Amino acid sequence: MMVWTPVNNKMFETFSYLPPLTDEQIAAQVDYIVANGWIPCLEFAEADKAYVSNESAIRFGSVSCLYYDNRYWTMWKLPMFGCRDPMQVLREIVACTKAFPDAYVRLVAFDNQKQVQIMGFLVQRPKTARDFQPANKRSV
């Protein structure tokens, strides 16, 4: 019997329970994105503004149901509308990580028919980050 660690095992939604994505696994996702006609976009956040919290709820009455700070990250440029080129997306991931080496960066895609974000996964963790575990040391 192995024990799943509480310290410090912070996850990041879709695909963070899998092994970290290879530059080619990331490219396979981008193909899936362009294949389906979805709008790609990049978002980023500094170390603090990355996790869900609720310090603005100090200003609220009894209305803090489904309110959490740090859902919104900062948009890299604009979403790439009708841009059906997998190459150019990968280039923007690079441009972005280069510009914010210390930021959390995620790739997201929008469906405009259902008007919703249809997929999203992390592409860069900052190097100073000490609150995650490598895939093998998650249970002791």
Partner: protein
């Protein structure tokens, strides 16, 4: 002129020449008349006693316009491979219905007729809710998009888990189980449908400890977490009392048993939820009493349309593959009916009418009951991302406990999603995807080992 006495319903209520109006509510009944009762008369009886008519001629008819108000049987198909079974089509004018009231709609269409001596069995298969009627409903408090937006969760199914045993756990223990499941990687846990407030665990105690588990798990994982606290109760006042406390605790989501609670109570709750930003998970407790048999009852697709109108953010859709019945083609149909804006007629999937929801939000199908990690690819294949999959036993039954149980299911789902996205066909390479992941993840491996032989196929 007023002519006292009994006559045939067909004289007034069978109109096979009628052109349905864009605002008429349409019903498709699976009729089985008594031997010697002509289909046309039986169909008219159903139309009559579900709208304006009784058993003998009343004089008051002349004071109003029976033409304007009457239910009309307007078409009868014989059922292939059946001696005495027909599909009777009834059109009801919009005027017949109270705006926004699922209760009223069901009171007319399924109120008395199912008990008639003149028939052996009756089944309501489908309803066509016209946009002008749909627009009278508040409908779901949030719906799929808004829910995903509120929870900040995208590009995969959601994972849940009913705490077990159903009854018997104390409040403190309940919260303990909840924390362990949530921190392993499930999005949601839930009260069992019959966990309300009982001598072994009073609701407010539970709500408090569960709120604490929700928050510990959230801080630990950094992902948003939830627990469907049950607001189902004996009286509306109690039901509200619980919903209020949940709001007061800041938790994201409550659940209600709409059918045992009832439509009236449910619509109240959905409105409260809209007004307070609470997500509303709907459990379909008791549906099988009504929807299981082919010859008699109301088919679930109707009970799902109803719920969408009454209001709910999630509704249990069944698993197909799990411990409870659910045929695949029909399920794919009512899942479209739950989620989509516009669903074209398709008799292969039991969809008798084109249903236009005119922008009413989508209800998220919840697949739950007797499922485990080996079903994962079949599940992802059936429902896609917009679904919530639940592993009760499939989590609290894992040999290493709830956190590893959770972790297992989360890895299983994440693997299939990646597989699907990478191009792999999940209907065929299913077992492969799962197997690759067990050899990779210890927790998943332990799970696959225990439930490898376990299937639900019968007769």
């Amino acid at each position: 002129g007023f002519k006292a006495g009994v006559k045939d319903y067909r004289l007034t209520y069978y109109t096979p020449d009628y052109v349905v109006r864009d605002t008429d509510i349409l019903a498709a009944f699976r009729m089985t008349p008594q031997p010697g009762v002509p289909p046309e008369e039986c169909g008219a009886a159903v139309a009559a006693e579900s709208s304006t008519g009784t058993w003998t001629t009343v004089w008051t008819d002349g004071l109003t316009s029976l033409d304007r108000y009457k239910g009309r049987c307007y078409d009868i198909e014989p059922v292939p491979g059946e001696d005495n079974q027909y599909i009777a089509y009834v059109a009801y004018p919009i005027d017949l219905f109270e705006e926004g009231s699922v209760t009223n709609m069901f009171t007319s269409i399924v109120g008395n007729v199912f008990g008639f001596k003149a028939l052996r069995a009756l089944r309501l298969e489908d309803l066509r809710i016209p946009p002008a009627y749909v627009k009278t409903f508040v409908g779901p408090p949030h719906g799929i998009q808004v829910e995903r937006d509120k929870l900040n969760k995208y590009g995969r199914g959601l994972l849940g888990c009913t705490i077990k045993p159903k009854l018997g756990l104390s409040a403190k223990n309940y919260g303990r189980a909840v924390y362990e499941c949530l921190r392993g990687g499930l999005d949601f846990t839930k009260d069992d449908e019959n966990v309300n407030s009982q001598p072994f665990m009073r609701w407010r105690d539970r709500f408090l400890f569960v709120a604490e588990a929700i928050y510990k798990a959230q801080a630990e994982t950094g992902e948003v977490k939830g627990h469907y606290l049950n607001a189902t109760a004996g009286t509306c006042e109690e039901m509200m009392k619980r919903a209020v406390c949940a709001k007061e605790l800041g938790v994201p989501i409550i659940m209600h048993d709409y059918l045992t609670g009832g439509f009236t109570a449910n619509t109240s709750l959905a409105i409260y939820c809209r007004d307070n930003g609470l997500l509303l998970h709907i459990h379909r407790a008791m549906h099988a009493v009504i929807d299981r048999q082919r010859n008699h009852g109301i088919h679930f697709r109707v009970l799902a349309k109803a719920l969408r109108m009454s209001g709910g953010d999630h509704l249990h859709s069944g698993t197909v593959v799990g411990k409870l019945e659910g045929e695949r083609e029909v399920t794919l149909g009512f899942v479209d009916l739950m989620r989509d804006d516009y669903v074209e007629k398709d008799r292969s999937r039991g969809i008798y009418f084109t249903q236009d929801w005119c922008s009413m939000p989508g209800v998220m199908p919840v697949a739950s009951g007797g499922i485990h990690v080996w079903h994962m690819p079949a599940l992802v294949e059936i429902f896609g991302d917009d679904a919530c999959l639940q592993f009760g036993g499939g989590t609290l039954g894992h040999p290493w406990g709830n956190a590893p149980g959770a972790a297992a299911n989360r890895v299983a789902l994440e693997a299939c999603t990646q597989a699907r996205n990478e191009g792999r066909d999940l209907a065929r390479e299913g077992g492969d995807v799962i197997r690759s992941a067990c050899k990779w993840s210890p927790e998943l491996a332990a799970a696959c080992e225990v439930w490898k032989e376990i299937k639900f196929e019968f007769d």
